[PDB]
Amino acid sequence: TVLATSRLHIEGDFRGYGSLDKSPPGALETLNRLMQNNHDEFDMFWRPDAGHNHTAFSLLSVYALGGSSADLERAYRDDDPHQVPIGAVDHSVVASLKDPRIFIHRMQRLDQYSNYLRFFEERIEARGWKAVVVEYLFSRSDAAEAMLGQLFEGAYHPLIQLGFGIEFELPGLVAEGLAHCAAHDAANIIPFFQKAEKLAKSGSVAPAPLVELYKEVRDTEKIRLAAKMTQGPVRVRDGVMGEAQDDIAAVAAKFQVGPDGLKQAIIETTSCAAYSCGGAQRPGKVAKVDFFFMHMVTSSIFLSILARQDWLETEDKIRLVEWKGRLDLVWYAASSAPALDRKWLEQYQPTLSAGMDWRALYRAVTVEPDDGHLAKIVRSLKWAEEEAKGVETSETIPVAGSGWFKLAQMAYDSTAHLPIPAKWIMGAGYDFLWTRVDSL
Ligand SMILES: [Fe+3]
């Protein structure tokens, strides 16, 4: 039977966090047609490692930046390589997923995406998306505890997809995100999250500023060297978690948010992620933004969005930000914990984006051939400027003020007019990766 939940209709004025210019007429109709095509025709996974379908991310971000029909069509065509036929649904498997032990049991299998999608669509059709999200992520059942770890998998893709669903209140997109969450292959980050949290709640770990926990990861050789350059997409599973799970778990336990600390913890995690991106530069090299640090920033807007949901307890909002901050330390370690310096973003001189404001940068991003990350990072950075309105740089907040837009300029300048593989450096701490980066 056709579910109402399967129909993605964005309607009304809402155009997204950090939006500036309204998309011109005709864009909304293009957005709905293409989001619906992507939803019905394509899987969430097009290859085993780094194979997340970005189509929904690229469309919704280009809409938020005020792109027209033609820009959304570019976004869709640019992600053609992301778009493979959606898996056949097994309807007896879908019926069985009502049992929480069969649910848990089939988790972390990529070929299950379509089964979990149909399941979550049926469940949302019956209870609505708010009820289902609390039930499957935040209710501390066994299923929900495993789904919460899964939410951060793949450098934050499930969180990002669920985040988009919640931001635009799209039931079918919330369903895609939950299904993505359930099906994502495991990087052995769940025990990192359990160990760090058990340590944090023990009463015997004093909290420290996140910026000092980045420093400790870099300065602890066993953690810094756990990841290997040529492990590529499995650095976290086979390197950071393989060699140093307990060690990084004891560091991450020091990141602890008090009951009145939610907004500052979002600003703290977002500032340190932006600081990763902008501060991991090398003398004599052009500016490049690390691909992983870029996901640490692109994911950050969705923390801000979950933080503002009426249907979610403040305890559950604080937990989300704790876990994201902690895993940002793992992604830092996975890029070989490069030396960070505030001087690079402070001193950065824009090139292609020199003299633009946010409105002109947004316009330039809407037309730029890209898989969606450029649009995602400039929007998270404009939003970060709003979230952290009035906050200045300090010992704990390393990027603020004009730094947010300066990073956006560096992401545009260092990425525009390049093929996708040349855009983002795949681990800023690995010296060899800089031999393939232009000198000054
Ligand atoms: Fe991505």
Determine the structural class based on helices, strands and strand pairing.
mainly alpha
**Overall number of strands:** 0
Binned strand content: under 5%
Integer tally of domains: 3
PDB class: oxidoreductase
Keywords: metalloenzyme, carboxylated-lysine, oxidoreductase
Assembly: monomeric
Entry title: Crystal structure of BTG13 mutant (H58F)
Notes on the structure:
The protein is globular, with a radius of gyration of 20 Å. Helices cover 57% and strands 0% of the residues. Helix 6 packs across helix 7 and helix 15 packs antiparallel against helix 16. It starts with 26 loop residues before the first helix and ends in a 6-residue tail after the last helix. The chain is mostly helical. It folds into three domains: 68 residues, no CATH class; 93 residues; 245 residues, no CATH class. It has 23 helices and no strands. Bound molecules: fe (iii) ion. The site of fe (iii) ion (FE) has 4 residues, from loops.
Concise summary:
The chain has 440 residues and is mostly helical. It is built from 23 helices and no strands.
Labels describing this entry:
57% helix, 23 helices, monomer, binds fe (iii) ion, mainly alpha, 440 residues
Helices, strands, pairings?
Layout: H1 27-41, H2 55-64, H3 69-78, H4 91-96, H5 100-106, H6 113-127, H7 129-138, H8 142-150, H9 153-167, H10 171-183, H11 190-201, H12 210-219, H13 221-224, H14 235-252, H15 262-279, H16 291-298, H17 300-306, H18 314-334, H19 343-347, H20 358-366, H21 373-387, H22 403-413, H23 431-434
Helix pairs in contact: 1-2, 1-3, 2-3, 2-21, 6-7, 6-10, 7-8, 9-10, 9-17, 11-14, 12-18, 14-18, 15-16, 15-17, 15-18, 16-21, 20-21, 21-22
The structure holds fe (iii) ion.
Fe (iii) ion binds at residues 52, 54, 295, 373.
